Amino acid sequence: SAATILKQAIAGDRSLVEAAEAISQQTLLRLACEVRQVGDRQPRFTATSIARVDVAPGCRLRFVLDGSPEDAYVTSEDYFKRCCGQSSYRGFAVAVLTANEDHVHSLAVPPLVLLHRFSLFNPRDLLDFELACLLMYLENCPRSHATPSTFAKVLAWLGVAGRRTSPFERVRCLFLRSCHWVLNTLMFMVHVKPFDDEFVLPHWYMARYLLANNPPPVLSALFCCVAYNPAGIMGSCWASEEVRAPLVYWWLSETPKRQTSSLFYQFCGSLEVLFQ
Amino acid sequence: SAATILKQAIAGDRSLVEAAEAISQQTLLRLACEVRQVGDRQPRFTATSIARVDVAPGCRLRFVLDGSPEDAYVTSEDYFKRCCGQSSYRGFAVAVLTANEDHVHSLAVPPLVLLHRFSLFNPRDLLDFELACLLMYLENCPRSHATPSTFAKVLAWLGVAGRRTSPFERVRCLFLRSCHWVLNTLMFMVHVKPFDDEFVLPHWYMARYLLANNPPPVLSALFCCVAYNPAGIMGSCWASEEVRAPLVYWWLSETPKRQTSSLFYQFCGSLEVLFQ
Amino acid sequence: SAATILKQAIAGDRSLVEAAEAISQQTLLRLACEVRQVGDRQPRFTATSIARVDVAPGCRLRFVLDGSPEDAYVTSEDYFKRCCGQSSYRGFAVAVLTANEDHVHSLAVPPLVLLHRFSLFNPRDLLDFELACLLMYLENCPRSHATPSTFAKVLAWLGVAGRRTSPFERVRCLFLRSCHWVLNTLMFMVHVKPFDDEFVLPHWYMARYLLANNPPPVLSALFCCVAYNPAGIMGSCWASEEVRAPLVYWWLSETPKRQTSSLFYQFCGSLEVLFQ
Amino acid sequence: SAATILKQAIAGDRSLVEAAEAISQQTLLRLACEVRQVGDRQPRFTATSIARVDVAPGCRLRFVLDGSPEDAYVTSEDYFKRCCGQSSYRGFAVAVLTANEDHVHSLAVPPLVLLHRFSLFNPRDLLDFELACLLMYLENCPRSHATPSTFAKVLAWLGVAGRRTSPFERVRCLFLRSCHWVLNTLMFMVHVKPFDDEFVLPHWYMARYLLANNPPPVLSALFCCVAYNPAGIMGSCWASEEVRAPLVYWWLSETPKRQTSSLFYQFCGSLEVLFQ
Amino acid sequence: AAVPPSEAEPRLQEALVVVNALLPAPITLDDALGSLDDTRRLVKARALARTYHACMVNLERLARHHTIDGAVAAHQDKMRRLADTCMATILQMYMS
Amino acid sequence: AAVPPSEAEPRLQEALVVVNALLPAPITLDDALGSLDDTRRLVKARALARTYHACMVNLERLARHHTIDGAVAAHQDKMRRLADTCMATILQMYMS
Amino acid sequence: AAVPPSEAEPRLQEALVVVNALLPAPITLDDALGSLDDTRRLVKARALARTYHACMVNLERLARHHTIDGAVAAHQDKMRRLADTCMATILQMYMS
Amino acid sequence: AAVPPSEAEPRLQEALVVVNALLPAPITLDDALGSLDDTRRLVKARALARTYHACMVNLERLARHHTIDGAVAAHQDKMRRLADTCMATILQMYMS
Ligand SMILES: [Cl-]
Ligand SMILES: [Cl-]
Ligand SMILES: [Cl-]
Ligand SMILES: [Cl-]
């Protein structure tokens, strides 16, 4: 596989940093949801918590929560404090995928394999919380809110968040590119020119054309306690029982959970080499 | 041990890649079986699920399942979907061994050591599922199906599967060579010239001659909820209680299980070295 | 991040050893307490066990335990033996932080993140036990014992302990610098010139001035079974429920606990490299 | 610490291999015992199983088991098969130490630290089983069997076992040197010249002289379901409750028990390095 | 066999090392390279999905704007055949 | 494709290696570098906390030691404004 | 004792690294090398198993095709002794 | 800022690596070096334990083989003082 990276770097005249970035850019997080559980009772997976997103004058995120009046915004900071103060709140569940695995109405990941793709995210600060909140919002965003104004505000905020983030902050970068994949695919699905067509999920690009109107079964066949928005344009993978049953089974398992903040192995230390 | 590899590479005039391949080729998977468990009830280990194997015109595997009519084939894809859709289905259990450990009617691995050789395989795609299915079939194949026609079809399919696989796909390679060991030993045991006599399990080569007819006890002594084919030529290791009790005990243990897809440690990442 | 170390080493003309030490010096242990649990009953976390500390002629630590007469000292060795002989004694719980996270009346670490910062310390020898005892004493030390005499004795003992310690004894070094952070901050909080003002916790330096008398809410907002000294000058982080509930929840969890003595990964062994 | 190895290699004019061997030779296994447990009932730790040891004409070990007639020997192979066939048999428990930690009537390892020194050994073959049996025998050997004849037979067998073993068989080497430490210390304790006085445990060398007859308390103070031989010369560490309670607690609390065969981390594989 | 330091002096080299995984666990390098290859093939396949869509729009235009006159039917047959060809090529790429 | 040893002889290099983490788990290099940066900014900010404290002491001195005479009120206004300026700068650093 | 960068400038080297285990866990290099050695000895031992088999076929031929005539008994003794020799050599290799 | 391969061609180096821990887990290099140092100090201290033992044997010989004659008492005092000196030195090494 290193010989493949070398061949790709030379063939495209891309530095090794650029060649590695093209490979890592194929990964994203999907199925973002808040986990709530009272003791050992039945857990709840909610992806509908944020109904609307807006950007404050000082480029800070503000939200309209599910069930709240249309123009009753809460700062992302106040929502972060409220969640941290809830004893039932366990963080966000997310599934790690490669772009080729998202097949629009299904995931090309068998349910027993998907079990091993989930991780639990406990936001370390406000920016982490905002990124998880934004990913979840974008995946569940209905047609009514998928507008040029929303797209412009989201991109501007992602631009500011991106400038604050270094490529060595691997988890923040993962959430940031996941937002870019979901955002650009959402724009494409509502027949709006994406900001970056390289960030339209590849099977979604095909599905918009192939499933447009009364598709033949042969084309539809290529694509096929959990609260998600049924009108969410980017959330159609949630409909699959082969997606929801592994999420619940992953949660219920007594085996310790992988932490999203630990997805990227790191070592920093001294190396001493002794030889004759 | 690295000095041993160096000595072997020079002595045989084999490149380091060839010397390493000769060492890794000594490893194989055995005791392939499907695991089914309803909640926390008694588990079931089935190695008899596939009664017959045939290759389709487009070199895809098709199976006659146990209990189904003689010529009632199911595609490997339909059997993969059926298993993925079964809530009781847990994947395949396999035991990792070196070729010198398979002693025909026993394994030269103490039961408490064998406990640590099992891993659970959750096929990542169709090819993975077909490989596990084929290994399990070959181990349980009776005399009636151990024919030149079956041998030719199996080799042709393995050839196509092999060309699709790179040596960096460690797990696929492991299942592929396991099929070659079981296939060539099976051919040898039915007195048919193997395709590759280097792939006849070494103790099986000795046992066919030494245990041919009314062997003396001194020669027999060298070799000695689980459904397996009692008429399976390559499945004689299954008869041993020192093989079946560790499989069941391994499954019931509350300690997390090793995933077959994780048998080969991998790291890919950046290395930065700072020195004065 | 290695390019950042290189830039810092050059810009400050600090060797790589000095540049790495400046980075590692930002880490410390806080919330030191003794853990006692009789079987599976309610655990007890005690940070008040040591009322007074004194240095013996041969520079060995002596303690006046809580509830004992004012001048009734026990040797650190006798207290180590007593704890080792108590069946309910489980060692010391400590939380690992960076200096920027200690916000005086709170920790800038969300409760679900703090859960992953605790480790259990089982002193390997007397010096280890003395260091954990001293850290806990300093964090809970009231105004009455925060005197120049106590400061001089503590610094002299830390100097002797420091000379006995190598920078490769990572855990001992961690406890030693944690004592220096808590000691120098304590001196600063009682309006006594610290021995090293670089070891005054940075938010504590700000809080002493900003919260001096009737602070405005806007300034107070920047800072906000468990027995701790409520009169302990350096123990104000203990008052927060977002500190104590994670400690108890971390303890009660069935997931195996991280050992403080294992915080720093180590490998020592042979490396053989074979190539053509 | 690598600078220490370099200084030691140069100062003693010892190769790096010799310098590393002197360091690793300080480690040994102690407290060897067989573990038996019927389901989840009370476990049994037995170090008394082998009453006598003898070497067969073909230099194979034979044993007189506890409770069997004085001259009723069983081959090591027959005892290995009997143990492998017992469903209650769990293998051998052993504690890893450095030579300076064995203080004759106590171990200089606190009970909560000792908990983390135990590992479970499941002999991989006959030689592994014989080594564990021999270590356990030597630790529990009474005065009556600590004779020149026994010493000669044990050394001759260890010599043959040593010639069969390479230094990269880390676990076999660990059991072999543990036998040499226990054997040479045993000879010294019965006032017989050891084969190698460098293999007399250092605190035992001091204790034989200092505790010879009516020792003063000040000298005695330097040294202080489990079946062990109370007349076992090398087994005096077993008398301590600070040794036995951690063994039992480790058996009932340590969820993923460390395997003695995995004590020495190993990696073998390909390394690819890409750079500009 | 051992060469003493007096004959071959040992060397000690020291460094600070920083190691970071490229990909989030449990994603392997093979997984991400396979995804990059699939994505590049699917980006090329956009031409086929666009062509299929143009055929389907032409079929809708023919049905909305409109016997012994076979002209409309001849146009519909041409669009149906080209869409079938696009569909066949897409299916071959998906079902390899 | 393989090059045999007879054409390109393999080399074997051996060493003793010692590896030690710089930081206690789960603290990352980014966490400790971020802390070093925050600490350096907060060490510089000590000047602001000291200046605010000076204003507050001056306000206490003015209130303790003491109408158509606006002198004391003019001094109090100056100290209140400078303390507000220090407070605003500290808040901007904390709430970025 | 520390050498500042101004006297010995630090160097930073960067690479992308790919590491892959050769063998499936928990199989060790010693296990696989021991298996390769056993297999090579057992491949050589095929000659002994084949010779033993030839003796046994000759014994069957002698018993099927057939006293003061000791010819058959003399042939059977020769085949029994050679098979015993083969058997003894195989047992020595297995039971070392 | 990125340098393309056309300006600085990448290099790929490949090797087979074998890594083995020197010590059994959880024993650290510091633990084993500390043990080697303690053992070397205790091997030197054998002289003190042997001297103490000689004083104790001399005391037994004096008591077994035997007033205004203080000769035996003078010998016992000398042996008791030397044993005390040995004991004091051993205790200082143990209780540092
Ligand atoms: Cl990050
Ligand atoms: Cl693979
Ligand atoms: Cl340490
Ligand atoms: Cl070994």
Task: Kindly summarize this structure in a few lines.
Chain A has 276 residues and is α+β, with helices and mostly antiparallel strands.
What does the model show?
Helices cover 40% and strands 19% of the residues of chain A. Chain A has 276 residues and is an alpha+beta fold. Chain A has one domain. The longest helix of chain A is centred in the middle third of the chain and has 20 residues, at 170-189. In chain A, 45% of the residues are buried. With 96 residues, chain E is mainly α. Chain E has one domain. The radius of gyration of chain E is 31 Å and the shape is rod-shaped. The two termini of chain E are 59 Å apart. Bound molecules: chloride ion (4 copies). Residues 169-172 of chain C line the site of one chloride ion. The PDB classes it as viral protein.
Shape by Cα distribution of chain A: globular
Oligomeric category: heterooctamer
Which radius of gyration of chain A do the C-alpha atoms yield? 20 Å
Largest β sheet strand count, sense and barrel closure of chain A? 5 strands, mixed
Q: For the CA atoms, what is the radius of gyration of chain E?
A: 31 Å
PDB class: viral protein
Keywords: custard, tegument, HSV-1, viral protein
Assembly: octameric
Entry title: Crystal structure of herpes simplex virus 1 pUL7:pUL51 complex
